[PDB]
Swiss-Prot record:
GO BP field: cell wall macromolecule catabolic process; defense response to bacterium; defense response to Gram-negative bacterium; defense response to Gram-positive bacterium; killing of cells of another organism
Other remarks on this protein: Lysozyme C is capable of both hydrolysis and transglycosylation; it also shows a slight esterase activity. It acts rapidly on both peptide-substituted and unsubstituted peptidoglycan, and slowly on chitin oligosaccharides.
GO cellular component: cytoplasm; endoplasmic reticulum; extracellular space
Protein name (record): Lysozyme C
Tagged with keyword Phosphoprotein: no
GO molecular function, one term: beta-N-acetylglucosaminidase activity
Gene3D superfamilies, sorted: 1.10.530.10
Amino acid sequence: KVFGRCELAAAMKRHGLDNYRGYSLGNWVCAAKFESNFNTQATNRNTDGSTDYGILQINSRWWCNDGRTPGSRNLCNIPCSALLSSDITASVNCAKKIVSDGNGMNAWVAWRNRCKGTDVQAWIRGCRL
Ligand SMILES: [Cl-]
């Protein structure tokens, strides 16, 4: 599923991401835009052989099991395919664990490079929330 900007904002808010660990909703929408272009089915392979999955590009090296990343962990306790669902619940629940691990949203490279320090409120502008 390819979300609309405001559609995704409302889904994330309903799932408890607004101001989660101090990160306003606009940060999460911005991250999703540049990680996946709002596409729940996005996948990308990394150099080390791990793969990033879903709307927030969660890495199989640490967070999910895809059966093909030897010596990796599965900290969210889920198959990586669950992160590709049109229902964003699994992605959000796993993102909450990631952002709580000490490094905040800096875990997301596109957030650090393209959202951090910008006017992220612009990403939820005009939305009915
Ligand atoms: Cl933080």
